[PDB]
Automatic annotation (TrEMBL), chain B:
It comes from Pisum sativum. [4Fe-4S] cluster binds at C45, C54. Chlorophyll a 1 binds at W59. Chlorophyll a 49 binds at H14. Signal peptide: none annotated. This is Photosystem I P700 chlorophyll a apoprotein A2. It comes from the Eukaryota. Belongs to the PsaA/PsaB family. The chain crosses the membrane at residues 3-25, 61-74. Chlorophyll a 47 binds at H6. It is found in: Plastid, Chloroplast thylakoid membrane. Chlorophyll a 46 binds at H6.
TrEMBL record, chain C:
One of its GO terms (cellular component) is chloroplast thylakoid membrane. Pfam families: PSI_PsaJ. It comes from Pisum sativum. It is found in: Plastid, Chloroplast thylakoid membrane. GO terms for biological process: photosynthesis. The keyword Plastid applies. Keywords: Chloroplast, Membrane, Photosynthesis, Photosystem I, Plastid, Thylakoid, Transmembrane, Transmembrane helix. The gene is psaJ. It is a single-pass membrane protein. May help in the organization of the PsaE and PsaF subunits. Chlorophyll a binds at E28, R31. This is Photosystem I reaction center subunit IX. Belongs to the PsaJ family. The chain crosses the membrane at residues 6-27.
TrEMBL record, chain H:
InterPro entries: PSI_PsaL (IPR003757), PSI_PsaL_sf (IPR036592), PSI_suXI (IPR022980). GO terms for biological process: photosynthesis. It is a multi-pass membrane protein. The chain crosses the membrane at residues 76-97, 136-154. This is Photosystem I reaction center subunit XI, chloroplastic.
Amino acid sequence: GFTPPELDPNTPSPIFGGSTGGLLRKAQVEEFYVITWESPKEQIFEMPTGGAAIMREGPNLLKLARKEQCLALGTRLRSKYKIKYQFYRVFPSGEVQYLHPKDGVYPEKVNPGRQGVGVNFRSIGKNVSPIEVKFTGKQPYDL
Amino acid sequence: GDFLVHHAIALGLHTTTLILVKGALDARGSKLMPDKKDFGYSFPCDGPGRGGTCDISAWDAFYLAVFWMLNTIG
Amino acid sequence: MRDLKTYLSVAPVASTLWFAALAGLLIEINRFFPDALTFPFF
Amino acid sequence: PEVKILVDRDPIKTSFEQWAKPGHFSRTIAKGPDTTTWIWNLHADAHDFDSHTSDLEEISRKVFSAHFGQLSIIFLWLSGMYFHGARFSNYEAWLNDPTHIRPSAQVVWPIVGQEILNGDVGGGFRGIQITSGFFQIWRASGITSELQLYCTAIGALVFAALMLFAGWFHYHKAAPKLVWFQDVESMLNHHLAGLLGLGSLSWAGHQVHVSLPINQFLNAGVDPKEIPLPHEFILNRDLLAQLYPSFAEGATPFFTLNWSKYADFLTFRGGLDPLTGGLWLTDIAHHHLAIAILFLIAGHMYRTNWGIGHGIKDILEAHKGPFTGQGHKGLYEILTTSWHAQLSINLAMLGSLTIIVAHHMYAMPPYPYLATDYGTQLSLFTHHMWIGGFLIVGAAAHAAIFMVRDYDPTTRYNDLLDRVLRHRDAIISHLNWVCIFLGFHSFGLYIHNDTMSALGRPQDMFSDTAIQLQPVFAQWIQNTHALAPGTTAPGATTSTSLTWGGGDLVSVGGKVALLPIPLGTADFLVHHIHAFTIHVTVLILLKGVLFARSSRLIPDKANLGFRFPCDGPGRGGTCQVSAWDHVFLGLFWMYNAISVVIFHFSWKMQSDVWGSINDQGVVTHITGGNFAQSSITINGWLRDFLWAQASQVIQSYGSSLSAYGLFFLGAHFVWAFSLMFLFSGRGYWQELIESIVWAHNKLKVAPATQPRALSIVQGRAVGVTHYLLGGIATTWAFFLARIIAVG
Amino acid sequence: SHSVKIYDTCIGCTQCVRACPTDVLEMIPWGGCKAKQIASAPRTEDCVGCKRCESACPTDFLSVRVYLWHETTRSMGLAY
Amino acid sequence: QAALYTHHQYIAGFIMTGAFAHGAIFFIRDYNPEQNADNVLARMLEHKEAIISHLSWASLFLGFHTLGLYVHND
Amino acid sequence: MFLISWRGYWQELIETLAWAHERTPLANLIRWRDKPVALSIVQARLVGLVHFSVGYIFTYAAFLIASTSGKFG
Amino acid sequence: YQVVQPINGDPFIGSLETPVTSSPLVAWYLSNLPGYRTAVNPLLRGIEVGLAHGFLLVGPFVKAGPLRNTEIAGQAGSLAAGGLVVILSICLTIYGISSFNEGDPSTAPSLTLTGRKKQPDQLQTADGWAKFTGGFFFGGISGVIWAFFLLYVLDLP
Ligand code: CLA
Ligand code: CLA
Ligand code: CLA
Ligand code: CLA
Ligand code: CLA
Ligand code: CLA
Ligand SMILES: CC1=C(/C=C/C(C)=C/C=C/C(C)=C/C=C/C=C(C)/C=C/C=C(C)/C=C/C2=C(C)CCCC2(C)C)C(C)(C)CCC1
Ligand code: SF4
Ligand code: SF4
Ligand code: SF4
């Protein structure tokens, strides 16, 4: 059992002068992303989009344009610094969707509450020939 | 002069034929991509893994052979 | 000394020695038997 | 902070043990090959020192000794040129009759039929005509006998040995400490004042004591064997005084500031000597003297051990403003840390310099009998353009390697760099737009002219006879240069260059040297082509640098390295996102730009400059002034330039120029050969190789080093290398056959 | 979205998950190998199709497969 | 006569490349290995490396020697 | 172009262009209905082969017909 | 003291504030162009835009056109500018037809730079866009006619 931490607005954002690498209309009408982390101090870190920003001591909130930017920055926060991070997807309705770490456990560490998806129980060479799924909507790897 | 150009023409027929035949016989798979039949006639590639796999599809073999055909008919 | 002979056994160096010998040979053969579209000795 | 000599003793042991361990420098490569890919990596990583080790001191020591190796090779090469000038040249016969004899410094052996390449170059000499220019240098240096060339070749060989020795010495015996390299103020002070200053002064010395007098006897028609030896001018000052009377004073006017009395052999006349067609040697010696003073002064700007002077860090930090923040703060730390940064700036400036040299040497021919030797002049201009362009693309490559490898805002921060990175999208978007605008409004005008000319509407073209696009600004400039002497340069007797000033056509041996170069709609259109091509090259390379770290498509791009093929077929496909692939793409555009530049040079010079002159002064240009009316259309370039001027190289068979015909066709061949690599991909080739490998295993002759297709990156590198070699060598053969036959 | 599948040749070395730049893959428990874990692709709607996972797999042949399929804003890696 | 000869030779070339293209597409989409077991068609796939390797040999021989003779004469 | 330049170069370039359009006054009054992206990998192979072939055929056709008909013999 | 700041204070919205972007002169001038008059009927803004542009297009067509040196028809080369107004008006029309459906509300922003709620421009509606297209056509034809009406006492006729 794991309860995703809710996104807390009014969480401070890093010190940064602005860049052309930030959000666009996509964030207004489609979706954007938010990564939060806890920092032990004020540090300089490389922004996945602009140049250099100053991570604030304590909780940090950072809105990014793509999920991959959140995961890249988080990978670095966990690597260069030793910082726990989470990030979420945010729709223009205000709805928030917690994304990562999905279990509260990082996905490279096996966690027992996890259900198999897209797992085929056979060697890859035992997939059927296309002719055997022709005119059916299926793909030989969907089995 | 006709001897020499006839052997160039033989070269073009053999090379174009080599590209197309290898493309057709390796369309279902190779050692680099044994499951190629599962990816269809035309796909970009199979990524930079396993050494790099650009132009590994059968459609790519056609695309390559058209150059040799234009050369031969030239 | 042993290491130097080893270096001289390496692919590019052995190749330059080998093809340089071959080139001198073929050059001298074309020097004593120039032109020649055929094997004339039958 | 006390600058001093710092080295370490015996850091690396001189041994053949690692000669026998291929890839010793790399921990992975040293394990030897499991596949053929190993063999390529061994050569691609050999000079990538900062990938071998992370210790800045070791890297700096490798760099230093490597530079010694380079200089050794250069001295061996100069030894070759002087030795061939002494032993296998017609340089003395040419020295007698320069306007007729063709310079030749290479002779071929009679083995397989190739002796036909030993052509009639004059002076009873059979050989290959040389376009390097060494004869005009040697004449300008007062060199007369082959013996002097021998002595120079021996000295050059000795210096090759000394440089090589110093490389081994400073890598294996006394290897400087890292602090020694980072003493930037000392280095700049010694290269400004010591290297450039004392070099220019020394050369001024040789010129006033050797070059000027010996060239006076040459110009006066004296036989070179009868000319006094250069040291006889140093001993008996009466020889010089007869030639140059000022030498009777004993350098007393120099100390008494009577320097105007030296206006005899130190002059500001400008223009060209009408006998030799080269710049006045008095002006040149005076020039090297002034340059010597300027650099000797410039070498005292930086503080070292005596408190006076500048620290460069101070200068940087003081320079900041309301738009750039704290800018320049941090650059001293970057430029004393990253070799790739220094190599980037130095490649940029050295290539740009080489291009400037290319212009200044044609518009101001510095050596005697150089301007009228059109093969040498075309060869020099084209050559230095190529060197410059290559060097600049290199500057982009190493700016990118800095960004990927040495950039770290948490350690060595710079405000200017951060701000640039913070509006990279604006910069690249605007450069993109300018490139499109320039494409349309330079090349689209050509297409306009081709279409109007084909439709029978030459009055609707862009032409000096239809819709004129006059380069009014450049015309005004060259007018101002023409009016400069006596007005804004009262000391200057004539124009700065004969391309400016009207009249004063200079002819040598019936051939013209320089006359005023006209400018019109054709020159306008071409110049905007050059603007266009340069802007697109800058776009590709700068875009490569600024997005090497990251982008909206790939946020973690810097973790993939400087040189990587892609990040896969996803995100729509990400091939050629690496900064390396931006250098790859920019090489083609440097080729395009420089190609159009040298075509513009050959075309314009043969049309409006070079040619023969009548006894009564009627000039016939090599081509009939057809630049203005034929270059304003792409069909005119295809027909009146390429199709016309290629006749020599396709007609060279059976002559001594047939080698240029062979290289014409062969360079076409390697260029087309590159298209195999550039248009395909290694997956196909690896599969084919699987079948070939099957065939070898069938006969027990499959190799242990498993055959592999080239890497994606290597496919690209091979491709661009053969593309560039083929194109450049094709234009090489074309140019040399053309200008050697018709020049 | 791109399809991503795991095959029971998987040995549970976790490298596909470690390589993934959009967090598509997880390690779930399993009894078929010694590491007692097998990969899974529960979030392929975020899959961009770069095949870093495939570059990371040590199994011969692969135990992750990315079948590039219907493109979306997320699969094309668009930040706009 | 020139225009027609050129016309039909280029048409013929494109048609040939297409023929091989659809051979490959056949192998991917329609080919049923079990239903063609051990017949001539499956045996094409079974010894594809001999086929491809010998086309490679013929193309290399023709290329080496035709190009070599042209270059010698030049 | 389509045969030597590959996609990622153009995709990043187009991203800078999207930024440019959204941040330009008067022009950002106009919005695209379809997100501008660089051509696909295969699509570029096809487009470049088609340009290569059209240029091939049209070049040789012009030379053939002009060189023969110009002489008619 | 520094001249460049993030856009509207938010440093993670992808843009910057410069003398070019946010300046009283620039902000006033852009705010006083018809396209940026959000409360005005789009038909009138289209009138102004069409008048300005249609008037502008006459110059290059007449002076650079094929009949430019036949002053008898060269002056009448303004028909070409009229035709370009027609084509542009087609482009506008199909842009609106493609972009806006009948009953959809405006897609323009309903906020100001200072955060207060705003009423969105009707230009970004199907009816508002149709009105702006009709206005641009009318004003464009009219501006071409007005420029062609003046052939006299101009250094470049
Ligand atoms: C004279 C004897 C000598 C000996 C036995 C050694 C021994 C060694 N050196 Mg040293 N060194 C020497 C001279 C010598 N060096 C000289 C003269 C220089 C000045 C250039 C250097 C500068 C130097 C550096 C900077 C480094 C070494 C390194 C090394 C070690 C690595 C092994 C190796 O170098 O393989 C190399 C084998 C080769 C054959 C190298 C050939 C390179 C030549 C000079 C290029 C020739 C250019 C060629 C003409 C281009 C035309 C090509 C054309 C035909 C296509 C090794 C123990 C490296 C090290 O420390 O290892 C960790 C290291 O980085 N040396
Ligand atoms: C002038 C252009 C050119 C050239 C010379 C080649 C050459 C070749 N192609 Mg290629 N191709 C080209 C363009 C070209 N291609 C283009 C534009 C495309 C579209 C991308 C393709 C796509 C392509 C495919 C898909 C295939 C080929 C194949 C082949 C090989 C055919 C067999 C052969 O002819 O034996 C050899 C012929 C030669 C001409 C080799 C020339 C070099 C000789 C050996 C020089 C000898 C070295 C000499 C001593 C100098 C040494 C230099 C020194 C620095 C070391 C051959 C090496 C087929 C193949 O691999 O065959 C097995 C194959 O499947 N090509
Ligand atoms: C294949 C069809 C086609 C046709 C029929 C034309 C016809 C014409 N072109 Mg065009 N052109 C075409 C294709 C075509 N072009 C393409 C594909 C390109 C891109 C390369 C061009 C680019 C081009 C340029 C750059 C120019 C022309 C010009 C001309 C005119 C030159 C003759 C002239 O001086 O008349 C008379 C000259 C006039 C100015 C009379 C104007 C004609 C009136 C305005 C017609 C009214 C138009 C109509 C209301 C709206 C049309 C759209 C309609 C479907 C709703 C002529 C009427 C020239 C031109 O138009 O001059 C400005 C010229 O500048 N063409
Ligand atoms: C007036 C003193 C002086 C002079 C003349 C030079 C000259 C040169 N330096 Mg050096 N340098 C100096 C002081 C000097 N340096 C100082 C104070 C520092 C900082 C501590 C550096 C550190 C430095 C580095 C890191 C490098 C150079 C390099 C070079 C060469 C650049 C390429 C070139 O121009 O080739 C032109 C060729 C010539 C002018 C031929 C004459 C060269 C003679 C033989 C050397 C004369 C000066 C020499 C230092 C005297 C010491 C010899 C003695 C100790 C035995 C060049 C020969 C590069 C290099 O090492 O290339 C191998 C390079 O990497 N310099
Ligand atoms: C003084 C200038 C200078 C210096 C010192 C360097 C130094 C370096 N460069 Mg740079 N670069 C330069 C200029 C320079 N470069 C220029 C002018 C360009 C434009 C082309 C580049 C573009 C560039 C790129 C794209 C890359 C580098 C890389 C590197 C590093 C690896 C070098 C290596 O091991 O390759 C080994 C050398 C070879 C394998 C030789 C290759 C043979 C060439 C391709 C053929 C030459 C043809 C010949 C002249 C003519 C035909 C003769 C033939 C028939 C025999 C190294 C530190 C690489 C790197 O990874 O950086 C870390 C890299 O990717 N450079
Ligand atoms: C002749 C071949 C060719 C052509 C036409 C182009 C064209 C272009 N390249 Mg490319 N390139 C080429 C070869 C070519 N390239 C090759 C071989 C490579 C591999 C190395 C590259 C790699 C490359 C890179 C990496 C880049 C470019 C860029 C560009 C663009 C530069 C901006 C510009 O000039 O816009 C204007 C367009 C032109 C000058 C083309 C001609 C325009 C005609 C004359 C106008 C006709 C319009 C008419 C109305 C048509 C309508 C008719 C109707 C029926 C539709 C441009 C469109 C740069 C870019 O993206 O742009 C900034 C860029 O970064 N190229
Ligand atoms: C009568 C006569 C004669 C004879 C002749 C003969 C006997 C021949 C024939 C010939 C032949 C014999 C030919 C052929 C050709 C062929 C081709 C051209 C082919 C092709 C193929 C393909 C294209 C394939 C396809 C495919 C694949 C790949 C797989 C799948 C299936 C299929 C089939 C689809 C002579 C001349 C002596 C003389 C006169 C008379
Ligand atoms: S470069 Fe090759 S591996 Fe990379 S995305 Fe393109 S086709 Fe695929
Ligand atoms: S293709 Fe890339 S994004 Fe998709 S699952 Fe594999 S690593 Fe993750
Ligand atoms: S890389 Fe392969 S073996 Fe390793 S966890 Fe992923 S699917 Fe399993």
